[PDB]
Write a protein that binds this ligand. Structure first.
Ligand SMILES: CCCCCCCCCCC[C@@H](O)CC(=O)O[C@H]1[C@H](O)[C@@H](CO)O[C@H](OP(=O)(O)OP(=O)(O)OC[C@H]2O[C@@H](n3ccc(=O)[nH]c3=O)[C@H](O)[C@@H]2O)[C@@H]1NC(C)=O
Ligand SMILES: CCCCCCCCCCC[C@@H](O)CC(=O)O[C@H]1[C@H](O)[C@@H](CO)O[C@H](OP(=O)(O)OP(=O)(O)OC[C@H]2O[C@@H](n3ccc(=O)[nH]c3=O)[C@H](O)[C@@H]2O)[C@@H]1NC(C)=O
Ligand SMILES: CCCCCCCCCCC[C@@H](O)CC(=O)O[C@H]1[C@H](O)[C@@H](CO)O[C@H](OP(=O)(O)OP(=O)(O)OC[C@H]2O[C@@H](n3ccc(=O)[nH]c3=O)[C@H](O)[C@@H]2O)[C@@H]1NC(C)=O
Ligand SMILES: COc1cccc(Cl)c1C[C@@H]1COCCN1C(=O)c1cc(-c2cc(C)c(N)cn2)n[nH]1
Ligand SMILES: COc1cccc(Cl)c1C[C@@H]1COCCN1C(=O)c1cc(-c2cc(C)c(N)cn2)n[nH]1
Ligand SMILES: COc1cccc(Cl)c1C[C@@H]1COCCN1C(=O)c1cc(-c2cc(C)c(N)cn2)n[nH]1
Lengths: 263, 263, 263
């Protein structure tokens, strides 16, 4: 059902079954499939394709030539009715592609809220993007990639399948990420390696001087002490008993499946 | 002529002269020029531009914002009526560009069958793509590039003009290819260098243990023996007298014009 | 006002207020905003979006899925009425994006004349592109970048914010430019470093043997003499008293704010 306060341009094609919220705006030459939900205040500028089982939240801005909900590029996918979920207040720029999940991968591609996805960013099947993230121009996620809250990924950078980009990470431009990046780390290169703690991001986001120091000490345990990860995990858990921000490392280790980026 | 069983969306523009086969589907806001042939069962999802002297085979799927047959980017091109040929059962994803040939280059851009061309892949004027190939997101071919059967090219990778990507090659992501890549080789880096034989691809595609060993021995002749290519060519031809798969090297050497990628 | 000799396709949307010059051509499914000026002979092929306060000159060719004048990607931008200016005889290929300026950056994104902007090139807010430039596929400028006359930027290359690409520069493909590139230099790598003088470009563009030698001597002063830039600046000014082409270095030094690319 199309809310009476929504605008649908006469040249747009909204298929019966689509749900369009109050004060949404569907611009010229858009296509919206029958299983799409578009939340209140969301704008599709023009020439946008949204299809599949796809739920989009409120106050998003989706620009021309973006493709949301489309068939993914996994050769294992065979047309099953998988899903895309997108949250609120995202800016989804020209030519961005966000593909539906695969049965094998859990069936869901998810994007949170307040993200900036720049021109031609790619979010593959079964990815999970959190909140307040930035993907710069042409940043490309392979299938099953996680991008955690506040992480930023620079222009022209690609991330290999299943990798985790931890919270508050900064991945430089022109990089290739082949393994998991722990929270709070700067990564860059091809393949990307660690380059210290994203101190400036943490400072701007309200982290205390004590928390940043504890995070830097956790980084040194991982990358400078010379100990194995298994030896380091209890020491990081010990540090998190005083500095709760360090618990992000613990939670990340439990999810990591590709090993950490290394020098 | 438009076959009576083809579907042409009321908002699509199919110019008189275009040939549309049985059970083809031209989606909304597509444009199909007067010299285009579209084979049986081929689907243009929406917002596709196909123009020029362009013949497309059967059962292809061409996604939104793709541009097929368009004027190429060679400054030497001046509007001559050159051609594009595309075979069967290709999946041509969002924003892919396939440009027409140049008179100087032979007049033809050719793509075979069963290929996967991912988001924003680029096939320049006078390229030749074989069968069962994959170009990952943003993979970019300069003019006159050959991509032989079963070769795969990773995300964000670019190939310099006139290079040959041999059969069953794997080119890693985030690479720049500046010379010719012999069949069966793994290449990666900027500039790309050889990294052994694509053993896993050959195994999955039915190559025998004996054939793979012979191919690996041919690789060692080229890259490990320390002999010159001219010295190695007869030894590889000798090996191909027993192992016919090795003949692919011989055929590749006759076409190569930029020298081989090297350590 | 739309000139009586301009063609506007029935499916295009040209908003009242737009100015369309003689013998211009607005193709199907284009959108042209009320503050756009399109000069005589300019062609929008199809599926082009032009909006914002945007002035486009004569005899340009703008291809499908390009976005010209759009809101930029700077988080500091808040909708102010900034501008785009584009000159004459540019070829602006599929999926190119040219974004409007920011108040903080001077309010203007500017492109000159006779440029080739290949598929998915990006010109960010407040950039300045001169005349006779080439941006190859996926070449990406961050905000505030200058690309001076005759410079060429290879495929997949990105330029960090505020950098200057000097006149007659050649930046290789697959590169990342993080600092300023003096006129006449070849740059490549990640990060890009200098690789001599773009002698072949200068030769083709009519530079004398004496001018090229003087330019090469200026390059050696900067990169081989071992002197500091401040020591070298007067020696280059001294050389320009005889060879006026060397004055380009002087003018570039006065604009440079990020230091020069270095070995
Ligand atoms: C420096 C890092 C650069 C990273 C660059 C990343 C660019 C990503 C672009 C976006 C892609 C995304 O939209 C889709 C995606 O990631 O899908 C894949 C899916 O996430 C995965 C897991 O579920 O499965 C698939 O990838 P795999 O590599 O695991 O697939 P595969 O085993 O079928 O191999 C794919 C092809 O490579 C061939 N191959 C594989 C291994 C090898 O050693 N040699 C070889 O030739 C193989 O024959 C086949 O043709 C999926 N692919 C395909 C083509 O099906
Ligand atoms: C690590 C590897 C990275 C690879 C990146 C590849 C990215 C490819 C993107 C797709 C491009 C494809 O669609 C079109 C294409 O490849 O066309 C060219 C055509 O395949 C070729 C042969 O037929 O001829 C042309 O390339 P060339 O390099 O041979 O052309 P040219 O000699 O005219 O030089 C082009 C520009 O570079 C300048 N130049 C050249 C050499 C030099 O040393 N310095 C210099 O400035 C020269 O002045 C001119 O402005 C063609 N170009 C142009 C712009 O006309
Ligand atoms: C090897 C080189 C690779 C180069 C790759 C270039 C790819 C360019 C793609 C085109 C982008 C272009 O269209 C827009 C652009 O360049 O805008 C920016 C604008 O030119 C700039 C100046 O005016 O200002 C902004 O860039 P800055 O980096 O200066 O912005 P910022 O300080 O707000 O930081 C942006 C994000 O990075 C985070 N950050 C910053 C620094 C740091 O150390 N850690 C960190 O996490 C910070 O929290 C924030 O979320 C602007 N960005 C944003 C996102 O607002
Ligand atoms: C550092 O800034 C980053 C880093 C990661 C993500 C994001 Cl979003 C940004 C914001 C910037 C500016 O806003 C547009 C997007 N940006 C970029 O993609 C980006 C990357 C680089 C860069 C520079 C250097 C010297 C190195 N070694 C690596 N990368 N320069 N610009
Ligand atoms: C290896 O997988 C390849 C290689 C070539 C072509 C293709 Cl099609 C693929 C399939 C994958 C997954 O399906 C989407 C497309 N893919 C990619 O582009 C790709 C490249 C890389 C990669 C990883 C490493 C560690 C290195 N050193 C280089 N490249 N990871 N993913
Ligand atoms: C050298 O040619 C350049 C360089 C800069 C800009 C432009 Cl426009 C061109 C024209 C070419 C051909 O016309 C399409 C665009 N081209 C490219 O982007 C491009 C870059 C490279 C390349 C090759 C090598 C060996 C290295 N080390 C770096 N880059 N090969 N092709």
């Amino acid at each position: 059902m199309i809310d009476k306060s929504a605008f649908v341009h006469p040249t747009a094609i909204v298929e019966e079954g689509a749900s369009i919220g109050a004060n949404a705006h569907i611009g010229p030459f858009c296509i919206v499939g029958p299983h799409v939900e578009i939340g209140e205040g969301t704008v599709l500028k023009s020439h946008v394709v949204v299809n599949g089982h796809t739920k989009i939240g409120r106050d998003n801005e989706i620009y021309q030539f973006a493709s949301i909900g489309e068939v993914n590029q996994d050769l294992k996918y065979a047309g099953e009715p998988t899903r895309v979920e997108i949250g609120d207040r995202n800016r989804i720029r020209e030519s961005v592609t966000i593909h539906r999940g695969t049965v094998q991968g859990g069936g869901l591609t998810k994007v949170g809220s307040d993200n900036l996805l720049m021109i031609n960013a790619h979010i593959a099947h079964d990815c999970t993007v959190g909140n307040r993230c930035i993907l710069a121009n042409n940043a490309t996620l392979a299938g099953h990639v996680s991008v955690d809250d506040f992480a930023i990924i620079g222009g022209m950078t690609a991330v290999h399948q299943f990798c985790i980009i931890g919270a508050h990470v900064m991945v430089g431009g022109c990089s290739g990420v082949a393994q998991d990046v722990p929270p709070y780390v700067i990564a860059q290169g091809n393949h990307a390696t660690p380059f210290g703690v994203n101190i400036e991001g943490l400072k701007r986001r309200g982290f205390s001087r004590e928390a940043i120091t504890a995070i830097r000490n956790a980084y040194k345990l991982i990358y400078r002490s010379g100990k194995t990860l298994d030896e380091v995990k209890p020491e990081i858990a010990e540090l998190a008993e005083t500095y709760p921000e360090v618990k992000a490392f613990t939670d990340f280790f439990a999810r990591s499946t590709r090993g950490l980026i290394r020098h």
